[PDB]
Amino acid sequence: MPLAFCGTENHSAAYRVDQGVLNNGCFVDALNVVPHVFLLFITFPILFIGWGSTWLHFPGHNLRWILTFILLFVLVCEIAEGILSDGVTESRHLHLYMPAGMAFMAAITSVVYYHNIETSNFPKLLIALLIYWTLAFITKTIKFVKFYDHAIGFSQLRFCLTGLLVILYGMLLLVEVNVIRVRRYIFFKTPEDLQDLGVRFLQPFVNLLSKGTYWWMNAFIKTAHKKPIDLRAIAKLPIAMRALTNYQRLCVAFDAQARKGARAIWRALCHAFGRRLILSSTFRILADLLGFAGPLCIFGIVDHLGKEQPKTQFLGVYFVSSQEFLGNAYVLAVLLFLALLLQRTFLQASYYVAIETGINLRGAIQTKIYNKIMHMSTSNLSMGEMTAGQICNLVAIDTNQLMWFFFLCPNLWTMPVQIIVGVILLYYILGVAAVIILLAPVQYFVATKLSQAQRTTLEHSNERLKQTNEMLRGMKLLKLYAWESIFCSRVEVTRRKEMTSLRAFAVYTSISIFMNTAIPIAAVLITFVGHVSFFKESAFASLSLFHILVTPLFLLSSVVRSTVKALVSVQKLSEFLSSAEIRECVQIIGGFFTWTPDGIPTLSNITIRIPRGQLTMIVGQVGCGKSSLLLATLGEMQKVSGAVFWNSNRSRGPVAYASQKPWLLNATVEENITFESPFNKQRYKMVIEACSLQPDIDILPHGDQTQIGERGINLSGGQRQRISVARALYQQTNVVFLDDPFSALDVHLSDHLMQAGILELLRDDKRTVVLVTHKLQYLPHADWIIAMKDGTIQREGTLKDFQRSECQLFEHWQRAKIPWRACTKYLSSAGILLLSLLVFSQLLKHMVLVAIDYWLAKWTDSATLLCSLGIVLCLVTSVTVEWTGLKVAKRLHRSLLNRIILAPMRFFETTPLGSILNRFSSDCNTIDQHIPSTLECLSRSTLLCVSALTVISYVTPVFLVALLPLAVVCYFIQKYFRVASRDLQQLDDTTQLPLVSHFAETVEGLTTIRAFRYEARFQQKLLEYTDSNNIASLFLTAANRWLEVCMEYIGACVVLIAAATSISNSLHRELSAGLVGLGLTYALMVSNYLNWMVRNLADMEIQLGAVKRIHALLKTNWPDQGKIQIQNLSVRYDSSLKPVLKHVNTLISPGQKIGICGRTGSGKSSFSLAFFRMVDMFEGRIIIDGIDIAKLPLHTLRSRLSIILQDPVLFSGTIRFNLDPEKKCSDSTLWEALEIAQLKLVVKALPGGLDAIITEGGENFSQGQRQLFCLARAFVRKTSIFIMDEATASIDMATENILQKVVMTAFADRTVVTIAHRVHTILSADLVMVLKRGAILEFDKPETLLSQKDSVFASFV
């Protein structure tokens, strides 16, 4: 029984070459063999030469790929047909399936060949492929015309298949010769060079296999596991994705639409992105339809295999009828497999095209927003209407969610089509669905109530977090007076109010999961119960349809919510976009200028001229239009009437300017000094000298490298005014405007040195200046002054004019992860009595869903109360999850508060408040309102997945042999993808932060930037920020889609193997395919349960990482003697190299209020810190009124001994709560204190009295009211001693009032120990001690020994 080529029968009569060679119907297949094996036998060594930087794709090549692939599809179909025809027959006969296998391999090799000839630019070498393609087109055309001569027609299948690849090969031969015409290589006598030089990200210019499967990502992601992904490793982002380019295209769209509001933005967005958005929607519709084809193949397979030879015979050859073709079993399985392997590639492509269009929308619209910042007026009507928070929330939230809307925009095209086709094929499947079509509005109303509760919850917990910030800012002051507990109680009360709100949030979000996971069960139950009781007419395919319908509905509910937010956002930006713009030597003639663009000119009759070569000191009344006139010269006022001659020694030059309000960019201080200018040491040193900035630089621990301004080193107002003057002065300009720099700079000697340096700089540059201020010490002397009285110019001339206008009278006046810490979370959070119930209910629910699936299979074979148990268990699990997360967050919150209470003040000195507040608030929010739902979703998704692989292994008990490599591959793919995705996620966050940082620093100092006309550099910084955000966003997106392709093909192979082994055991061993079919419907859902599994697993990784930060914060009658004799108590902090206090055996006598101030460099502050027993006094002996002060409860010791401070602060609350909240002793003591200290005329003038709100520090009480509250605590806490510190900045009368209050404290308490680096006012005392260079050097029990000795008087001089 050997291998006959055509067939052995009739004594070699099929080998009869008589009656023509071509009229033999088997010999033509042998003719069709020739071109395919010819191309193989001429192109394998070539390919091996191939096997042994610059790319150019050939012209007209997309149709090559689609014709080659669709010919792969029909050639696989002819492989199936050849096997099905040669197998049920008596012979072998081997002429049905020898040509197709080499043809399949030939198509594979000719596309590898076309790829290897596209990689290497050598166009004269595709002559072989084209002469091949023409030869095979001719040969199958001959076969088809002889099939036509035998008059077969379309009834038999092989006629149709042959005609299909005839027109296939003809049309793709025509593609080849169109390329021949274009590139003109063979018979003609006679590129992406821009796309060459650039970026790493070559996904839009790569072959189709890498466009589909993200093959180029592979070498990236495998590179990413060894070394991390720096920003330099990220691409340069090519021209087609440059934000400027999309912005130009969009502005052309704007101009075309606006030549021919909300509809304008709508039309503009549609015109700029519809040809891709529509392409994305088209791919999405095709993916929906090929998803919706699946169940037809499963139903057909099970019906024909339950059906338990072909009729036609033309010329002795058996042709399979087409109904029997599409009625076959194995053929439909292979078709199902190839349909899934193409469906689940178009879905990812649709995702990606929507994402790419979204990133270009974000780019162009952010660029447009910033361009219309660059022309927006900074008025008190323009900026006075809309603050910077409005425009910051606009940019951030609006543009990101408009992007998320154009993410969800094809969904609003498909989920309706999804629902309609679901209803249609559910009627074809089950005969004569409203429940499942009623589960998207359930999600809509539940999400609506959830978002309302979340809004209210967030704006309540915002007040809770603000109170916590106000209770964590004064940590040292409240711990010093032992006043932590009352603020902890007011926090725990606000926390429990927020906890009631969070319980309502969790209820309304448990019900979404419950409705989400119990609507299909009731839908199927009502469906089949109708089918039996109400219908009585006649399954697993229907269940799979139930899955395919269930998935879009909740997404569509979110789409509708996003649509509403998008419409509101476009309304917001349209009402924003039509606000007032700005506009289109010195001389101003007509004089009318206002802010509102009509009516009430705010500055009129202005006829003032200031030509070049000048130094104008200006003067005027208080707010008489000085900054208004300066900005009006700058062209920043709506000038109604007048003209502006303008000539720099008609275009404007770089006028330096400095507004009344200072401004500093959140950058380095030298970067905030140089301001995008080259750096020379001389002028920089001169400006640091003139503005006295070298002591200011030394006042900072980095100086010219510290992150100045907001989000960094907190500066002072005089420092910021001086920094602004330095940045204004350095920029090397032909004019200089100084609008009162020494107004806020109250340092007179600094101001005088600055005035002299200003004269020197403006005198040594020979450039015009204009200084508008009230410093009249020099302004009427040697300036060309100009005075604006009542908003008008009086005289711009010499000093004799001010001696002629009654103005001198005023001048005469790695990568480790969760499970240890995650185990600690679940253990310390839950308690096993609810964790066990949660895991048991989840496992039981999934066992019930498996069981009801098997019961559905058996009843369908033979042609309820488990779906009810399922719904109840789903409700139970959703309740248990939300309840467990709520209790978890509650007890963790109280734990965080308790560990923050039991802390030393040295940690607050060490660690910033930002770390404690950040890992408090953001991680508490994450482990309170975001982590439990994701945990529940993971615990439902991976358990559905483990269930599904259990079902596949149960149906086909041979599957597990193929499970082990699939799980190994999934484990390795999970590992390498996790390694890339975590780092890329952090790179996304740390790149999306500086763009909105730029929008803050732009919106703050806008008029200075628009004053310099130095917009293009910030334009480049904006475009750089937008590019650095977009490249990370596109790589994160494309990594997600590549993940989904790789894991989803792993799942597809699982489906194929499971179905194959189940069908193999059901053809012969008769597996009773219901157990097999129920396996298959989990095999289809595996394909996306893995999807949900992988994406949610990454999210579970990142959020449990901030629990790590949580673990890090979990890791760490009245004494009236005053006779505490310290006996040699030596102090240390790290006990490393330098103790400060040494051997100080010093006593404060009763009455002898020893105010002991010393040397401020070495021994002043350390003793002042160590005075409250709040530091490590490493030796000696410290008695306190004869008691042991080294082993006492420090809460009781620090409660009843008041002090004063250097930088005092008032805790906000009731006035009795601001005085003594824990005590609340008596009203008359508070009247005596708050009368006799200070602020009696504010307390009695307060609206409430002792029960009035301390308005966040006493915002309009006094500044001496802080010291008054200190004295209140001194009079209230039975405090004989009162340790006082000096005022940092105060008035001399304020220091005298503090001294008078200290005199009253001496008259009433008489115990005090004060240190003051202001030694010349610290002389009113009783005893003193000077402890210089860390010793007991001087002690003066009379006050005259300080004034008697040399050095103490030298410190007193």
Residue numbers in the entry: 1 to 52, 63 to 200, 207 to 276, 283 to 330, 335 to 458, 464 to 569, 576 to 621, 678 to 742, ...
Task: Quote the study on this structure.
Uniquely, the sulfonylurea receptors SUR1 and SUR2 lack transport activity per se but instead are devoted to forming the ATP-sensitive potassium (KATP) channels, wherein four SUR.x subunits form a complex with four subunits of an inwardly rectifying potassium channel, Kir6.1 or Kir6.2. KATP channels are gated by intracellular ATP and ADP, key features which enable them to regulate membrane excitability according to the energetic state of the cell. In pancreatic β-cells, KATP channels composed of SUR1 and Kir6.2 couple glucose metabolism to insulin secretion. The SUR1 protein has an N-terminal transmembrane domain referred to as TMD0 that interacts directly with the Kir6.2 subunit, followed by a cytoplasmic loop termed L0, and then the ABC core structure comprising two transmembrane domains TMD1 and TMD2 and two nucleotide binding domains NBD1 and NBD2.
Further, as an additional control we determined the structure of channels without any pharmacochaperone or ATP (referred to as the apo state). Interestingly, the dominant class emerging from 3D classification for the ATP-only state as well as the apo state presented a similar conformation, with Kir6.2 tetramer closed and SUR1 inward-facing. Of note, a dominant inward-facing conformation in the absence of ligand was also observed in another ABC transporter, the multidrug resistance protein MRP1. These observations suggest the closed channel conformation is the most stable for the apo state under our experimental conditions (i.e. no ATP and no exogenous PIP2, a lipid required for KATP channel opening [Nichols, 2006]). Here, in both the RPG/ATP and CBZ/ATP structures, we observe strong and distinctly shaped cryo-EM densities within the same GBC binding pocket. Such density is absent in the ATP-only and the apo structures, supporting assignment as the pharmacochaperone ligand. By contrast, the KNt cryoEM density is absent in the apo structure, suggesting that when no ATP is bound to Kir6.2, KNt has little residence time in the ABC core central cavity. The fact that despite not seeing KNt, the Kir6.2 channel is still closed in the dominant class structure is likely due to loss of endogenous PIP2 during purification.
